[PDB]
Amino acid sequence: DILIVNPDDFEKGVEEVKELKRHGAKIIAYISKSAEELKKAEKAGADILIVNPDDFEKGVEEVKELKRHGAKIIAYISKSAEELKKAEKAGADILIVNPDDFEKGVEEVKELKRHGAKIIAYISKSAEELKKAEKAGADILIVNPDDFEKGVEEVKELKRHGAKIIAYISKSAEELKKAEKAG
């Protein structure tokens, strides 16, 4: 459902976004540490702007800069529920848990669910881990694979399971086109 470009550089990232826009991709996302870079992604056809911050102080300023800019949909990646609560404040629409540890990740999800966070997302290589994140209150299940053929099967399994919203992270529009085909 959501195709997430993980760019090598500005130029290559924009080329993938443009190719997904050309393909007729429905919901395109782009990951960067920088509001300025994200603004050039939104132009090329990205619907979701994902802040992946160096540190939390720096991350929240990029969210306030995209909020001032009038970005349609802002997402924030963090290991911590506490950082994501404050990311939401500055106007992050989607709070993305990128955990060190499965056990810890799911507790981050439960904590956000208690606080009544707007939209919760969870990144994992594993459909089985994402099923459990969903149980704990994740709305968006993000497949971040170790390899392509393996990634696309995890998408097909989350489709069979019945996920609200499936996302996939790739460097490659070619990979993202097949992930969309898979659900």
Residue numbers in the entry: 1 to 183
Give the article text.
To assess whether the model could perform sequence design for de novo structures, we tested our method on a Rosetta-generated four-fold symmetric de novo TIM-barrel backbone, a (βαβα)4 topology consisting of an eight-stranded barrel surrounded by eight alpha helices. We had the model fully redesign 50 four-fold symmetric sequences for the backbone and selected 8 designs for further characterization based on ranking by the model PLL and other metrics (see “Methods” section), using no information about previously confirmed sequences. Of these 8 designs, 4 are cooperatively folded proteins, as indicated by circular dichroism (CD) wavelength scans and by the presence of clear two-state transitions in thermal melt curves.
We successfully crystallized 2 model designs, F2C (1.46 Å resolution) and F15C (1.9 Å resolution), and the crystal structures validate that the sequences indeed fold into the TIM-barrel structure in agreement with the designed backbone. For F2C, the model uses an isoleucine to wedge between the long and short helices and forming a Tyr-Glu-Ser polar network that extends to coordinate the loop from the beta-sheet to the short helix; for F15C, the model has a different solution, designing phenylalanine and valine residues (F10, V14) to pack the long helix against the shorter one near the top of the barrel. Particularly interesting are the Tyr-backbone contact and the His-Glu-backbone polar network for F2C and F15C, respectively, that help coordinate the helices across symmetric subunits at the base of the structure; these are the only hydrogen bonding solutions designed at this position among all previous structure-confirmed sequences for this scaffold.
